[PDB]
Chains A and B, each alone.
Chain A
Amino acid sequence: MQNKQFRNKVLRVLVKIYMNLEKPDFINVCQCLIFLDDPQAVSDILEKLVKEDNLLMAYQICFDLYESASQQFLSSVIQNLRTVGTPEPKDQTLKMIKILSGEMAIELHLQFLIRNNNTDLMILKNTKDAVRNSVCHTATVIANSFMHCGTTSDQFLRDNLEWLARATNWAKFTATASLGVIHKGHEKEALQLMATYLPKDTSPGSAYQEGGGLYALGLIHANHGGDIIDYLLNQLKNASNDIVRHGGSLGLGLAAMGTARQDVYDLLKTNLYQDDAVTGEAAGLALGLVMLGSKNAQAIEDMVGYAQETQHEKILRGLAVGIALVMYGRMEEADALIESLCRDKDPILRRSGMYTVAMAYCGSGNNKAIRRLLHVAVSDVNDDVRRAAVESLGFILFRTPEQCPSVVSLLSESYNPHVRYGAAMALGICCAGTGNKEAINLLEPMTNDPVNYVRQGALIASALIMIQQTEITCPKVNQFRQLYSKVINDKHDDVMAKFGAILAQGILDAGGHNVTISL
């Protein structure tokens, strides 16, 4: 549990030993460059690739450094490597060009993930048997987006058109967004596929198709290098009501995540200056994404100054996530900011302090914030910070899966159902991708209670653990059978309990058991 005051020096002095040896190792330069993130520690290894004249060894370090461990440090190292070389000349050019591409991973993932799919008629037929026209209509298409993610399988949605556009509401927006979750990584078939739906009059009666086209396009071009953002500014400049603003703000902000461009900041501010709660919520969600690591001076004070001067709540949660996601790596900085903003009279901003401190203290590097996290989880009378409290606890304690259920086992069966639900989200996020049974043996008391909240979060938390698990290792028959009885027992259950039930069933079937999640 280092404080980063000496770890970076110990690493930057222990990386000088392998360069003097007979051969350089990759595990130490990776495990150091994932923490120190210093430009002076990469300028040597990026220029030694030409001196060593070894092509095969650079592909691994380039693949994983360009893969993860940085976004803006990659945005700087791409031009640092762009400056090196010509403004073996013929080989270094194709090397430097082909290493920063990053689309080869999308091609191979699209290839094996295009030839490894496994679909069954029992799941989708069961969804059509349990589908309702009001609530779970979005659950069926979000589960279909989960199972058909990456495989671009629109043939399931090509069966009939009377099951999707039968109701003019947000269900079509979630259907087109779910379509954006189905296919991803397409520079021509995406925009062409969206334009081919109604290229007749250029006037859709339902704007949710256009808003879902912009939001879905932002889902497709997430973190891509061939962004169409330049065209998305001329398309967002068009005057439209709550669909180009909302869907265009979400898609444009997601596509411009990490760029820290002042242009999207300006047009985003003039997009939120209309005092509307929905386009301001999307403006906050986009501003938090695009401001990753920027830490603008007047932006935080402008948002917190914009918070208390309005009565809407969606603007307060949108700016809450907006000022929450912007805070990354400010452990030594946001102490007075979060400590000062913790005593605010607004419960929404009180949740924004914990959501903000969640990503700031990732890595279990601060045992102090938990004092006020659990202290406001138990002491405060409003259930908003109580159910929104322990998400930061799981986000900081995601390292150890065993230590979480020992301290959240009391929160499994808490006083109010809100701490039970937020604690269910905590068990869902802390034990995800692992095999710890300390939450699984506690899932049985969570799944039976007169309150539908703890049942919904219990089915979601149970759905986040059973993924990527074999039956011969652990007896999962209990939660498989009790999870399968919810879609047949939906007649005697609540309307939202079946929503979270089939929505929880779409988690295991996501991608046909091929794709998973990792923290």
Chain B
Amino acid sequence: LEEGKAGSGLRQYYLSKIEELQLIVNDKSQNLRRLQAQRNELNAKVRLL
């Protein structure tokens, strides 16, 4: 055996690094959507003007 713990184990660790890339895409979506909320709140503010 020694595949699910070693081969699929390093495949799962590579999946964890893929989860790190999805954490970079994740927090990029977070701060980009918060800045999007800032611009939306400012343009909505002059819309209230």
Touching chains A and B, CB distance < 8 Å = yes
Within 8 A of B (CB), among A269-300: none
CA distance A413 to B41 in the complex (A): 9
Nearest to A410 among chain B residues (CB) is B33
Residues 390 to 449 of chain A near chain B (Cβ within 8 Å): 409-410, 413-415
Contacts of B33 in A (CB 8 A): 409-410
Q: Please give, as numbers and ranges, the residues of chain B lying within 8 Å of A410 by CB-CB distance.
A: 33, 36-37, 40
Residues of A within 8 Å of B43, CB to CB, are: 415
State whether the Cβ of B23 lies closer than 8 Å to any Cβ in chain A.
Answer: no
- CB pair B36–A415 under 8 Å, yes or no, is no
Per-position contact with A for B26-49: 1 when CB-CB < 8 Å, else 0?
Answer: 000000010011001101100100
Please name the residue on chain B nearest to A406 by beta carbon: B29
Closest Cβ of chain A to B12, distance in Å, is: 21
Distance in angstroms from B26 CB to nearest chain A CB is 10
Identify the closest chain A residue to B40 (Cβ). A415
Report whether B47 and A415 are in contact in the complex, using a CB–CB cutoff of 8 Å: yes
Bound complex: CA of A454 vs CA of B33, how far in Å? 21
**CA of A415 to CA of B39, assembled, Å:** 10
Q: Is the interface of B mostly helix, strand, loop or mixed?
A: helix
A413 to B47, CA, bound (A): 13
Q: How far is the CB of A290 from chain B (nearest CB, A)?
A: 44
**A409–B40 CA distance with the chains assembled, in angstroms:** 13
In whole angstroms, how far apart are the Cα atoms of A409 and B37 in the complex? 10
Q: Which residues of B contact A414 (CB under 8 A)?
A: 40
C-alpha gap A415/B47 in the complex (Å): 9
Binary per-residue interface labels of chain A (227-259) against chain B in the complex, 1 for a CB within 8 Å, 0 otherwise = 000000000000000000000000000000000
Q: How far is the CA of A415 from the CA of B38 in the complex (A)?
A: 11
Contacts of A415 in B (CB 8 A): 40, 43-44, 47
A414 to B40, CA, bound (A): 7
Q: How far is the CA of A409 from the CA of B30 in the complex (A)?
A: 11
Residue in A closest to B33 when the chains form the complex, CB atoms: A410
Please indicate the chain A residues that have their CB under 8 angstroms from the CB of B40 in the complex: 410, 413-415
Measured CA separation A409–B43 after assembly (Å): 18
Q: Closest B-chain residue to A416, C-beta based?
A: B47
Nearest residue, chain A, Cβ from B47: A415
Min C-beta distance of A412 to chain B, whole Å: 10
Bound-state Cα–Cα, A415 to B44, Å: 6
Distance of A417 from chain B, by nearest CB (Å): 10
Q: How far is the CA of A409 from the CA of B33 in the complex (A)?
A: 10
List residues of B (11-29) whose CB comes within 8 Å of A's CBs. none
Smallest CB separation, B41 vs chain A (Å): 8
- State the Cβ distance, B49 to closest chain A Cβ, in Å: 14
Q: What mask results when residues 87 to 104 of chain A are scored 1 for a CB within 8 Å of chain B, else 0?
A: 000000000000000000
Inside 8 A of B41's CB, which chain A residues have their CB?
A: 413
Chain A residues contacting B37 (CB-CB under 8 Å) are: 410, 413
Residue of B nearest to A414 (CB): B40
Residue of A nearest to B30 (CB): A406
Q: How far is the CA of A414 from the CA of B37 in the complex (A)?
A: 9
Q: How far is the CA of A410 from the CA of B47 in the complex (A)?
A: 17
Give Cα A379 to B36, complex, Å.
15
Tell me the bound Cα distance from A409 to B41 in angstroms. Answer: 14
Which residues of A sit under 8 angstroms from B44, Cβ to Cβ? 413, 415
Least Cβ distance of B47 to chain A in Å? Answer: 7
Q: Which residues of A contact B47 (CB under 8 A)?
A: 415
Q: How far is the CB of A71 from chain B (nearest CB, A)?
A: 40
* A415, B33: Cα distance in complex, Å: 14
Closest A residue by C-beta to B39: A415
Chain A, residue nearest B44 (CB): A415
Q: Shortest Cβ distance from B7 into chain A, in angstroms?
A: 25
Minimum C-beta distance from A367 to chain B (A): 15
User: Whole-angstrom distance between the alpha carbons of A422 and B43 in the complex?
Assistant: 20
Q: How far is the CB of A378 from chain B (nearest CB, A)?
A: 10
CA distance A409 to B47 in the complex (A): 20
Separation of A444 and B15 alpha carbons in the complex (Å): 38
Nearest-neighbour CB distance to chain B for A251, whole angstroms, equals 45
A409 — nearest CB in chain B belongs to which residue? Answer: B33
Distance A409 CA – B36 CA, assembled complex (angstroms): 12
Could you tell me the distance in whole angstroms from the C-beta of A7 to the nearest C-beta in chain B? 23
- Provide the residues of chain A in CB contact with B36, threshold 8 Å: 410
CB distance from A420 to the nearest CB of B (A): 10
- What separation, in Å, do the CA atoms of A414 and B43 have in the docked complex? 10
Q: Closest approach, in angstroms, between the C-beta of A322 and any C-beta of chain B?
A: 36
Which residue of B is nearest A450, CB measured? B48
**Closest beta carbon of chain A to B36's beta carbon, Å:** 6
Residues of B within 8 A of A413 (CB): 37, 40-41, 44
In angstroms, Cα B33 to Cα A413, docked, is 12
| Distance between A185 CB and nearest chain B CB, rounded to angstroms | 49
The 14 sampled A-B contact pairs (Cβ below 8 Å) are: A409-B33, A410-B33, A410-B36, A410-B37, A410-B40, A413-B37, A413-B40, A413-B41, A413-B44, A414-B40, A415-B40, A415-B43, A415-B44, A415-B47
**Which A residues fall within an 8 A CB radius of B?**
409-410, 413-415
Q: A410-B36, A413-B41, A415-B44 are in contact. List 11 more A-B contacts (CB 8 A).
A: A409-B33, A410-B33, A410-B37, A410-B40, A413-B37, A413-B40, A413-B44, A414-B40, A415-B40, A415-B43, A415-B47
**A-B residue pairs, 7 tightest by C-beta:** A410-B33, A415-B40, A415-B44, A410-B36, A415-B43, A410-B37, A414-B40
